[model samples]
Target: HMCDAFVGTWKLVSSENFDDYMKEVGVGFATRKVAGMAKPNMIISVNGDVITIKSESTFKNTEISFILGQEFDEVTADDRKVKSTITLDGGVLVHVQKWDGKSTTIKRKREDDKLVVECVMKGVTSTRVYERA
Candidate 1:
């Protein structure tokens, strides 16, 4: 089941084009400022039909929850996101999200020395290449 796929804590690492990626999403300027100043806590947990993702930082507290394998309406967090779909596309976890301005799909994987995340969509795309902490 989808719930079994994402239920754990993950450390944040580096990414390609972090600034533009957050900008395209709806992360307000103030929130972005904080996002830049402190490290991010990216955690994904799930229970039955509910999934909760929290991106924690010293400056802001962000979280999102939804059902697994099901597309539902959601409000993007202050940092990035608006409305989107999250599903497991093969072994690649997929997220197609919009933050009022731009949107993209983020594919996640664990590679050697880091957690590899690829974001793709119209007019905007990026890869968050992160090393384990």
Candidate 2:
């Protein structure tokens, strides 16, 4: 039921420390500027054992389809080619990505009426909050 609860559209509400996190991840300056400006909208859907996460923004659109706990190849929005896995732990959707000899972890948890996404890389953390739309 944890995954089923996330089956809905969510709109970006706010973000914090994203610039610093992007810098640590080696995202280029121009791309970071554009990415910072875009307020992405997320649509999460689950059908059978597959989960799909679609994100739309002025800068780009990205969709990731995967089965929970299964490893898969993924090309990130920042163009990083990586192996990724999504798993549920302590009621949080934890997505882990490994690439270029580095790793990034994203934890998505539902808190009250909002969804909180915490992105961590190189000890830097970025928080993005979203509300159901």
Candidate 3:
């Protein structure tokens, strides 16, 4: 049986100071401005390592997939090519990202009906949480 609570398609209902979150992730002002207002719909289909999360927006559509506990290649939402890996830490999904140009890691997990993300860039880390609608 599936966890019906997590089966539906979820869209961005609202954010908590997303501007600051984007800024902390080193997003440029122009991009942050658009991203702050851009509501993305997340369509997740989970079947073990075949998990896929589609971030859909009116301006741009991006999707990323990963096999849990294995190495995979993904082109990030920002179009960065990365060799990615993932693991489950205390029920949290942690991703290790190694880009062709840079090295970073992103940890994302579900916490109380929300998606919490921790992105580390050049030793600086930023965390963001997105709640379900």
Candidate 4:
């Protein structure tokens, strides 16, 4: 598997400046409160040409399955529906979501023994690190 390094169960180890990142992404106050408390486990798997990323948390769970470079519809955890896709770039899985002419990008990559996730929304950015579970 070309994505072997990233295929596994991962548990969040830490998140930095996520609240402001969520706010920048237009999440409501109530949802931000709950989302801030969530420590999601990301399950990555591959079958055929599709890759699935399942974010599981007590507050809610959201999953996305896609083939590289193909567009799909996604309802975000904050309840925003957007056009989404994932592609490999610079050794990272670059996930982009667009809605209402606005967009955000998230990059996921493996570093040493950790999986690092970086979310970018306009001027705000957040980093979340995870370890294999």
Per-model TM-score versus the true fold: 0.71, 0.97, 0.70, 0.98
Candidate 4 accuracy as TM-score: 0.98
User: What is the TM-score ranking, best to worst?
Assistant: 4, 2, 1, 3
lDDT of candidate 1 at residue 84, scale 0 to 100:
65
lDDT (Cα atoms) of all candidates against the true structure: 0.65, 0.93, 0.67, 0.95
True-structure RMSD, every candidate: 3.2, 0.8, 3.4, 0.7
Tens-digit lDDT string for candidate 2 (14-96): 99999999999999999999999999999999888999999999989999999989999998888999999999998899999
Q: Model 4: C-alpha RMSD to truth? A: 0.7
Clashing pairs in 2: none
lDDT of 1 by residue, 31-54 (tens): 667665656666777777677878
Model 1, poorest ten-residue lDDT window? 73-82
For model 4, give the 10-residue run with minimal summed lDDT. Answer: 1-10
| Candidate whose lDDT is highest | 4
On the 0 to 100 scale, the lDDT of residue 82 in model 4 is 97
Candidate 3 lDDT over 7-60, as tens digits, reads 446766555655664565456878777766777876767775477767788757
